[PDB]
Amino acid sequence: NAVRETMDVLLEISRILNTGLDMETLSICVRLCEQGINPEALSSVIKELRKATEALKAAENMTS
Amino acid sequence: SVLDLLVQLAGSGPPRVLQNVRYGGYDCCHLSGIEADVRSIISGEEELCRDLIRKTLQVMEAAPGTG
Amino acid sequence: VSRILPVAASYSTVTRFIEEKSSFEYGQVNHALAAAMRTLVKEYLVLVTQLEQLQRQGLLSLQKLWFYIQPAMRSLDILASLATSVDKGECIGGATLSLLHDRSFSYTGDSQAQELCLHLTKAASTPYF
Numbered sequence: 419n420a421v422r423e424t425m426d427v428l429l430e431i432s433r434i435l436n437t438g439l440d441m442e443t444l445s446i447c448v449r450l451c452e453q454g455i456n457p458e459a460l461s462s463v464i465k466e467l468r469k470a471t472e473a474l475k476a477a478e479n480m481t482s
Numbered sequence: 483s484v485l486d487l488l489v490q491l492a493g494s495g496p497p498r499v500l501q502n503v504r505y506g507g508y509d510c511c512h513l514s515g516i517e518a519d520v521r522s523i524i525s526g527e528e529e530l531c532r533d534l535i536r537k538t539l540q541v542m543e544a545a546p547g548t549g
Numbered sequence: 550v551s552r553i554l555p556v557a558a559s560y561s562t563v564t565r566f567i568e569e570k571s572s573f574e575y576g577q578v579n580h581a582l583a584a585a586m587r588t589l590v591k592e593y594l595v596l597v598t599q600l601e602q603l604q605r606q607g608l609l610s611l612q613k614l615w616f617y618i619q620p621a622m623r624s625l626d627i628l629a630s631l632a633t634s635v636d637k638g639e640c641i642g643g644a645t646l647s648l649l650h651d652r653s654f655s656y657t658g659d660s661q662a663q664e665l666c667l668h669l670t671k672a673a674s675t676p677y678f
Binding site for chain 1: 490
């Protein structure tokens, strides 16, 4: 229960923080952090994949 | 580290443009000014939405329509 | 004119088909098929709107309408043929889905019709699925 409450607290916090991490994205980041993955590397990968996803979604939208 | 990652991600969402009593000296234009500004923002936003939908329809009516 | 008019005839058939098959009694499959037809008819109306705009600009004529309408002529012929066949056999449920499969195969000859029918078949199977 404590894990779930921390999870949805982080969800609300990120939503206020104008960063928009979703349910499973937050779970994945939690699992990586307990796996021993640097938060900064996680965020860098997240931002790079956000940019790549934006570009790819634009391209696929005009490719529909 | 999750909080740090959230910190780096912060500000990455879409920006938001819209989201006993007075002692006789508490009479302040700021409260009434804020109310006026809010009621301005509502109206303005509605007319902006109307303009944007009108522009979208104007473009579509100038567009071939099959793609 | 009479070469183009079959498109409008097909349209009057499609409209009657939609109206009939949007009554609850005619079944959810037919309801969704009518909804898809309503989308297609909206597209048709948009096309005719654009042609009206070009009329109102004094920039269209006869053969241009005949040229512009040829893709739409084929599309509407196909749509009305499907609607008429489904109506005349009063197909419901898996019967109608069967008919839609077979028609989609018979309309393999033209890619426009193939794409339209594949869209329709996915959409209509969504309720059935």
